[PDB]
């Protein structure tokens, strides 16, 4: 489980030096992503590594696209 070196921004906030793994399921075609140029490849459990400072953004992104955050684990 690597990634924290590049995921955590170069800002030296101790709060920001924390990454978390999101497990997302059911990434469906919804009205929110009708004009998505790319196509969904997997609707099962996908793992997204999110730094602390972007956890606000990512979960919103997951929630607009119908994905279900089933688990969140410290990295």
């Amino acid at each position: 489980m690597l990634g924290q070196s590049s995921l955590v921004g170069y800002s030296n906030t101790q709060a920001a030096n924390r990454v978390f793994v999101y497990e997302v399921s059911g990434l469906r075609q919804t009205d929110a992503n009708e004009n998505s140029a790319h196509d969904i490849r997997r609707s099962g459990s996908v793992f997204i590594k999110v730094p602390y400072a972007r956890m606000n953004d990512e979960m919103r992104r997951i929630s607009r696209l119908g994905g279900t955050i089933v688990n969140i684990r410290p990295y």
């Binding site: 709060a15 978390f20 999101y22 956890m55 979960m59 919103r60 997951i62 929630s63 607009r64 119908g66 279900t68 955050i69 089933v70 688990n71 969140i72 684990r73 410290p74």
Partner: protein
């Protein structure tokens, strides 16, 4: 996302049949009480800052270990994050009140909020306690009889309370 009308629509589409007379009559009753719902939404958003601040101050008063050094609400960044969650929970409860369905609250706010708090070490029970304090403050505000056309708002108060219960039970 669902509202009060689209939920009945989606259930009917799954069954592949038209809305029955009773469902149409149920939605007519929902529209007849729609003015109370809008005005209740307006009263919560008009006192949002007071609701959030009073609930948070009361929460630290009865849970001083949150604001003690080492507590989860200690330091300015975590304190600001705490008030922001308070405000976020309140805002999505108003969304659910506006739409008449809990789908916005569950899909966009409570989706993964429990495991967000578990992963961050956030004391979700204290989050639930703060949400209940908003519930008492917001229900008192919605039920305030001054400066408003008198009517019975028991149904909408119970619905708003139910949304607040969903959020408090989700974070617990």
């Amino acid at each position: 996302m669902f509202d009060v009308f689209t939920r009945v629509v989606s259930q009917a589409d799954a069954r592949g049949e038209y809305l029955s007379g009773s469902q149409l009559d149920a939605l007519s009753a929902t529209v007849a009480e729609g003015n109370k719902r809008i005005d209740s939404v307006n009263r919560i958003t008009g006192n949002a800052s007071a609701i959030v601040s009073n609930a948070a101050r009361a929460l630290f008063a009865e849970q001083p270990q949150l604001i003690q050094p080492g507590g989860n609400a200690y330091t300015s960044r975590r304190m600001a994050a705490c008030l922001r969650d308070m405000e976020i929970i309140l805002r999505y409860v108003t969304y659910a009140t506006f739409t008449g369905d809990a789908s916005v609250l569950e899909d966009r706010c409570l989706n993964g909020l429990r495991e967000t708090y578990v992963a961050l070490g956030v004391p979700g029970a204290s989050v639930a306690a703060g949400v209940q304090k908003m519930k008492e403050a917001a229900l008192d505000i919605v039920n305030d009889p001054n400066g408003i056309t008198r009517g019975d708002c028991s149904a909408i108060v119970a619905e708003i309370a139910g949304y607040f219960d969903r959020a408090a039970a989700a974070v617990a």
